[PDB]
Write an enzyme that holds these catalytic residues in place. Structure first.
Site, PDB file in Angstrom:
ATOM      1  N   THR A  33     -16.000 -11.283  21.501  1.00 29.86           N
ATOM      2  CA  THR A  33     -15.188 -10.693  22.557  1.00 29.86           C
ATOM      3  C   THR A  33     -14.805  -9.246  22.266  1.00 29.86           C
ATOM      4  OG1 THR A  33     -13.248 -11.719  21.524  1.00 29.86           O
ATOM      5  CG2 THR A  33     -14.291 -12.901  23.382  1.00 29.86           C
ATOM      6  N   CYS A  56     -20.965  -6.898   9.886  1.00 29.64           N
ATOM      7  CA  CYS A  56     -20.566  -5.514  10.075  1.00 29.64           C
ATOM      8  C   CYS A  56     -19.289  -5.233   9.281  1.00 29.64           C
ATOM      9  CB  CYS A  56     -20.360  -5.239  11.564  1.00 29.64           C
ATOM     10  SG  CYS A  56     -19.969  -3.557  11.981  1.00 29.64           S
ATOM     11  N   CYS A  89     -32.009  -7.414  12.966  1.00 27.01           N
ATOM     12  CA  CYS A  89     -31.946  -7.971  11.620  1.00 27.01           C
ATOM     13  C   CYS A  89     -32.302  -9.454  11.592  1.00 27.01           C
ATOM     14  CB  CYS A  89     -30.545  -7.742  11.034  1.00 27.01           C
ATOM     15  SG  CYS A  89     -30.231  -5.996  10.605  1.00 27.01           S
TER      16      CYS A  89
HETATM   17  N1  LIG Z   1     -14.539   1.251  16.130  1.00 28.00           N
HETATM   18  C1  LIG Z   1     -15.376   1.944  15.146  1.00 28.00           C
HETATM   19  O1  LIG Z   1     -15.777   3.055  15.343  1.00 28.00           O
HETATM   20  C2  LIG Z   1     -15.751   1.270  13.862  1.00 28.00           C
HETATM   21  C3  LIG Z   1     -16.334   2.025  12.906  1.00 28.00           C
HETATM   22  C4  LIG Z   1     -16.691   1.460  11.730  1.00 28.00           C
HETATM   23  C5  LIG Z   1     -16.448   0.099  11.541  1.00 28.00           C
HETATM   24  N2  LIG Z   1     -15.850  -0.664  12.484  1.00 28.00           N
HETATM   25  C6  LIG Z   1     -15.650  -2.081  12.200  1.00 28.00           C
HETATM   26  O2  LIG Z   1     -16.784  -2.912  12.989  1.00 28.00           O
HETATM   27  C7  LIG Z   1     -16.320  -4.143  13.173  1.00 28.00           C
HETATM   28  C8  LIG Z   1     -16.439  -4.479  14.676  1.00 28.00           C
HETATM   29  O3  LIG Z   1     -15.754  -3.445  15.369  1.00 28.00           O
HETATM   30  P1  LIG Z   1     -15.382  -3.705  16.967  1.00 28.00           P
HETATM   31  O4  LIG Z   1     -14.630  -2.503  17.500  1.00 28.00           O
HETATM   32  O5  LIG Z   1     -16.603  -4.000  17.768  1.00 28.00           O
HETATM   33  O6  LIG Z   1     -14.442  -5.046  16.915  1.00 28.00           O
HETATM   34  P2  LIG Z   1     -13.179  -5.346  17.957  1.00 28.00           P
HETATM   35  O7  LIG Z   1     -13.418  -4.738  19.363  1.00 28.00           O
HETATM   36  O8  LIG Z   1     -11.888  -4.837  17.278  1.00 28.00           O
HETATM   37  O9  LIG Z   1     -13.172  -6.996  18.107  1.00 28.00           O
HETATM   38  C9  LIG Z   1     -12.816  -7.737  16.970  1.00 28.00           C
HETATM   39  C10 LIG Z   1     -13.384  -9.167  17.147  1.00 28.00           C
HETATM   40  O10 LIG Z   1     -12.974  -9.935  16.142  1.00 28.00           O
HETATM   41  C11 LIG Z   1     -12.217 -11.179  16.802  1.00 28.00           C
HETATM   42  N3  LIG Z   1     -11.181 -11.639  15.932  1.00 28.00           N
HETATM   43  C12 LIG Z   1     -10.169 -11.022  15.310  1.00 28.00           C
HETATM   44  N4  LIG Z   1      -9.447 -11.956  14.625  1.00 28.00           N
HETATM   45  C13 LIG Z   1     -10.038 -13.153  14.853  1.00 28.00           C
HETATM   46  C14 LIG Z   1      -9.711 -14.415  14.406  1.00 28.00           C
HETATM   47  N5  LIG Z   1      -8.665 -14.849  13.564  1.00 28.00           N
HETATM   48  N6  LIG Z   1     -10.453 -15.484  14.762  1.00 28.00           N
HETATM   49  C15 LIG Z   1     -11.533 -15.319  15.576  1.00 28.00           C
HETATM   50  N7  LIG Z   1     -11.857 -14.063  16.027  1.00 28.00           N
HETATM   51  C16 LIG Z   1     -11.100 -12.983  15.657  1.00 28.00           C
HETATM   52  C17 LIG Z   1     -11.694 -10.673  17.907  1.00 28.00           C
HETATM   53  O11 LIG Z   1     -11.342 -11.769  18.865  1.00 28.00           O
HETATM   54  P3  LIG Z   1     -10.173 -11.519  20.035  1.00 28.00           P
HETATM   55  O12 LIG Z   1     -10.791 -10.978  21.299  1.00 28.00           O
HETATM   56  O13 LIG Z   1      -9.523 -12.847  20.313  1.00 28.00           O
HETATM   57  O14 LIG Z   1      -9.143 -10.500  19.500  1.00 28.00           O
HETATM   58  C18 LIG Z   1     -12.819  -9.783  18.460  1.00 28.00           C
HETATM   59  O15 LIG Z   1     -13.754 -10.545  19.087  1.00 28.00           O
HETATM   60  C19 LIG Z   1     -14.847  -4.109  12.765  1.00 28.00           C
HETATM   61  O16 LIG Z   1     -14.700  -4.750  11.574  1.00 28.00           O
HETATM   62  C20 LIG Z   1     -14.526  -2.585  12.628  1.00 28.00           C
HETATM   63  O17 LIG Z   1     -13.451  -2.370  11.644  1.00 28.00           O
HETATM   64  C21 LIG Z   1     -15.504  -0.105  13.667  1.00 28.00           C
END
Ligand SMILES: NC(=O)c1ccc[n+]([C@@H]2O[C@H](COP(=O)([O-])OP(=O)(O)OC[C@H]3O[C@@H](n4cnc5c(N)ncnc54)[C@H](OP(=O)(O)O)[C@@H]3O)[C@@H](O)[C@H]2O)c1
Ligand SMILES: NC(=O)c1ccc[n+]([C@@H]2O[C@H](COP(=O)([O-])OP(=O)(O)OC[C@H]3O[C@@H](n4cnc5c(N)ncnc54)[C@H](OP(=O)(O)O)[C@@H]3O)[C@@H](O)[C@H]2O)c1
Ligand SMILES: O=C(O)c1cc2ccccc2c(Cc2c(O)c(C(=O)O)cc3ccccc23)c1O
Ligand SMILES: O=C(O)c1cc2ccccc2c(Cc2c(O)c(C(=O)O)cc3ccccc23)c1O
EC number: 1.5.1.30
Lengths: 207, 206
Positions: free
Chosen positions: B12, B109, B188
């Protein structure tokens, strides 16, 4: 006479903020500022209509600043500090949330002309701050609000002219904008919808 | 090694949603673990199986991992500013479930901060980066076939499929579209050339 008359300014104590504040008060705006406790507005300068003391990193403080406004101007920054930071992007997240809660649509926010560059050609010394400008611009673009992305080149000390070029969605023909002209442009963006959803690069040749 | 059934954790999120969509359109049979079903879009590509639960609940993870060929991990905490262990504890549950069900392949990731000097990390991202490091270690020590995906800034540019993948280091570009990042997570699944490597996807948009 003013569709936009109550505005919040974030970063009013900064280089561009101070002259934007002065110009806004002279133009008849009712200005609310958010200032950090240890850095209030100078005794000499113009006085805003309302002062909130707090931090853009506190949603509660941002909410108090955005409540009741017609529009928001964002001139946040980290002064001379080139260190990795999220203050601008996290501040923008709080501003977006507050604007949606309070029915404010218009946000004019300053990032940097480096966002119009080949990202690999930004000077490494400036990359940490540019990375947060990138994060901030994404927050504001994705918000759905009426967002003018102001992306200036070097901010200088030259006069207010009102005669600068505004380049839409690309780099402009000069590499400086005076702080006074940049503030003039931020306020001009409140009086028109023509820049909504665009990136704008204000620049001028001072002569 | 041919992968048909995958679990996606974090479906999500911003990268998860486009990874899910692309996976469904490509023909994968996708299982997602979601805390709230209403966060999945009403229209368009829908996953084959929805488990409602929490990555912190070992039973919920076990139910999601059972019967899969591979696992994609796109968890994140979004707003955690101070020490947090949700991702690393989630990864521990995923590893235990993969081992119990004979699932070999995980593509997870974290972030390109794991390839930079620690002084590059903004103070308010140090806690999440600390837990990325913990999650990476959990996966590297697990003995599973693990592709470490360490992206730079995640943007909103359209899907190109033309990005570069840099192995065990940083590449030239400093942005990856969320759509391209999801594209790479699925790539991958079709090869073992990235197993045991760190991967840095990036591109120049325009
Ligand atoms: N934004 C950037 O530019 C960037 C850069 C480098 C690295 N990253 C890292 O890449 C990864 C993915 O980033 P993103 O922005 O696509 O992720 P995101 O939009 O913040 O979404 C996080 C996902 O993890 C789920 N989640 C969190 N806690 C959970 C739990 N206890 N149980 C089940 N699901 C859970 C969330 O579900 P819900 O919908 O219920 O919250 C959501 O689906 C992250 O680790 C981020 O730190 C991001
Ligand atoms: N200088 C250039 O040539 C140039 C070129 C392109 C773009 N830019 C960018 O343009 C923007 C404006 O630059 P500038 O020189 O006018 O700004 P500045 O002099 O750096 O002022 C920054 C403003 O942000 C406030 N601020 C910082 N952190 C805050 C926080 N947590 N809560 C509330 N307020 C906070 C500061 O308040 P305090 O008084 O409390 O510090 C100050 O009012 C910056 O983002 C800058 O990076 C600069
Ligand atoms: O004095 C300085 O430290 C300074 C250093 C620079 C280094 C590389 C390129 C332009 C620089 C400029 C002018 C300038 C530009 O020329 C452009 C452009 O043409 O897009 C964008 C800029 C964006 C932010 C700041 C300056 C910008 C500066 O002033
Ligand atoms: O791109 C980056 O370099 C970047 C690097 C990260 C590294 C580790 C964890 C989160 C990161 C985010 C999360 C994030 C944020 O941290 C912020 C913020 O600070 O306001 C806003 C976001 C808006 C949409 C999606 C994610 C957002 C990034 O963005």
């Amino acid at each position: 006479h003013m569709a936009v008359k109550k505005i919040a300014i974030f970063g009013a104590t900064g280089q561009t903020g101070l002259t934007t504040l002065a110009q806004a008060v002279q133009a008849g705006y009712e200005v609310t500022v958010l200032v950090r406790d240890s850095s209030r507005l100078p005794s000499e300068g113009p006085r805003p209509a309302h002062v909130v003391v707090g931090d853009v990193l506190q949603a509660a403080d941002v909410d108090k600043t955005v409540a009741g406004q017609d529009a928001v101007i964002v001139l946040l920054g980290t002064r001379n500090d080139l260190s990795p930071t999220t203050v601008m992007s996290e501040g923008a997240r709080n501003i977006v949330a507050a604007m949606k809660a309070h029915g404010v649509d218009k946000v004019v926010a300053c990032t940097s002309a480096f966002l119009l560059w080949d990202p690999t050609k930004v000077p490494p010394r400036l990359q940490a701050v540019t990375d947060d400008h990138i994060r901030m611009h994404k927050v504001l673009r994705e918000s759905g609000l009426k967002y003018v992305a102001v992306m200036p080149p070097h901010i200088g000390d030259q006069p207010l002219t009102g005669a600068y070029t505004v380049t839409l969605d690309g780099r402009g023909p000069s590499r400086v904008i005076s702080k006074h002209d940049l503030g003039h442009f931020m306020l001009r963006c409140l009086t028109t919808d023509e820049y909504d959803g665009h990136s704008t690069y204000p620049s001028h040749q001072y002569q």
